[PDB]
């Protein structure tokens, strides 16, 4: 059985969404995924009765829709013709900029930091030494942001493009909270283990920002996660060690000024030294009145609002899905 509610986008003005029950059957099992639309061919019924007794004289019968044809409102791999046309690109030399030229044509400049994002999700090899140690197969990214930048659009492009990309927000906007804990479910009342998003994003890339507004609870978690790639717990009668092979990409916020002083970045930032050490690449954005850049940007804004050579994006996501494995 599946709950369904009214579409929040096309509400007539002032009114409220309501619910209805939908019952699945044999070949109709598990077509959807929560948070989507659906197009169903429903027959309209109600339940028969439950336990008529002394109540109000008004008969209260809840109505149930059974549906026949579940459809999406108006999954990706390689093929033989897709693995031989694959080799037509990979033989070339100038594929380096062309990847960056197909990354994000919205944000105009900033060639280095677009290249670093292109390198980070593209993956590494851990190459575990036999018996001794594995160093790392992950890329640790720091990006000191600035208000007055489209830095959220970069990580927005990541979650659309990548295979396993989970945006774990800074503070309380998502259901995740980056710390595993034994919780019950109000839908179901039993205790269920709920790992963090870093538990979730193993062999995936997580996107966490506003590090300054993160607690010491979060700060010990990020410290342990980049340390030995494994999270241990000591809850009620349970002691396990779950693994985590994430890759961390940041989006920070400068303290006070947009760029504080001649003082260095560790003096500019309000974070600590060991998380700075475990971060490898450090992307810095700039906010300055540059005469050529403002004419480009403002006319790009108006062109975006009068609306009132790169690889097409299906192929490059087919590229990295096939390559990284």
């Amino acid at each position: 059985r599946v709950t369904l509610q009214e579409a929040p986008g096309t509400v007539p003005p002032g009114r409220l969404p309501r619910h209805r029950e939908v019952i699945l059957l044999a070949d109709l099992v598990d077509v959807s995924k929560p948070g989507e639309e659906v197009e169903v061919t429903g027959i309209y019924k109600n339940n028969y009765d439950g336990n008529l007794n002394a109540k109000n004289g008004f008969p209260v019968f809840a109505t149930i829709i059974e549906a026949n044809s579940i459809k999406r409102r108006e999954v990706f791999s390689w093929t033989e013709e897709e693995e031989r046309e694959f080799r037509k690109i990979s033989r070339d030399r100038g594929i380096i900029d062309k990847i960056i030229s197909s990354m994000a044509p919205s944000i105009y400049g900033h060639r280095d930091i677009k290249t670093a994002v292109a390198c980070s999700l593209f993956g590494g090899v851990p190459k575990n030494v036999n018996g001794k140690h594995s160093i790392r197969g992950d890329i640790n990214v720091l990006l000191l942001g600035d208000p007055g930048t489209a830095k959220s659009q970069i990580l927005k492009y990541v979650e659309k493009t990548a295979h396993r990309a989970v945006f774990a927000t800074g503070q309380g906007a998502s259901a995740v909270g980056l710390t595993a804990s034994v919780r019950k479910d109000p839908i179901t009342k039993e205790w269920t283990l709920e790992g963090g998003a870093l538990v979730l994003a193993d062999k995936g890339v997580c996107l966490i920002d506003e590090f300054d507004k993160m607690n010491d609870q979060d700060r010990t978690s990020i410290h342990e996660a980049m340390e030995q790639q494994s999270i241990s717990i000591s809850k009620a009668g349970i002691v396990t060690t779950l693994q985590a092979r994430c890759s961390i990409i940041a989006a920070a916020n400068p303290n006070g000024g947009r760029y504080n002083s001649t003082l260095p970045l560790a003096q500019n930032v309000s974070l600590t030294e060991p998380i700075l050490s475990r971060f490898d690449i450090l992307c810095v954005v700039r906010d300055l009145v540059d005469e050529e850049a403002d004419e480009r940007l403002a006319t790009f804004v108006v062109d975006s609002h009068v609306r009132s050579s790169p690889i097409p994006q299906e192929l490059l996501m087919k590229y990295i899905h096939y390559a990284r494995t």
Partner: protein
């Protein structure tokens, strides 16, 4: 037991006693020194602690 600081993501380090929410029973919740009895304790950042 490897520990970075006193704090893991959900695991304490010292002898914590948590009451059982069912039956209201006292038991030993956990930590580190009870676990690694007769063994090795690894603690990072003793002064950042």
């Amino acid at each position: 037991v490897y520990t970075s600081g006193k704090g893991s993501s959900a695991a304490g380090l010292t002898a914590s006693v948590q009451r059982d929410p069912m039956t209201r029973e006292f038991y030993l919740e956990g930590g580190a020194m009870v676990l690694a009895d007769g063994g090795v304790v690894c603690i990072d950042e003793f002064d950042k602690m």
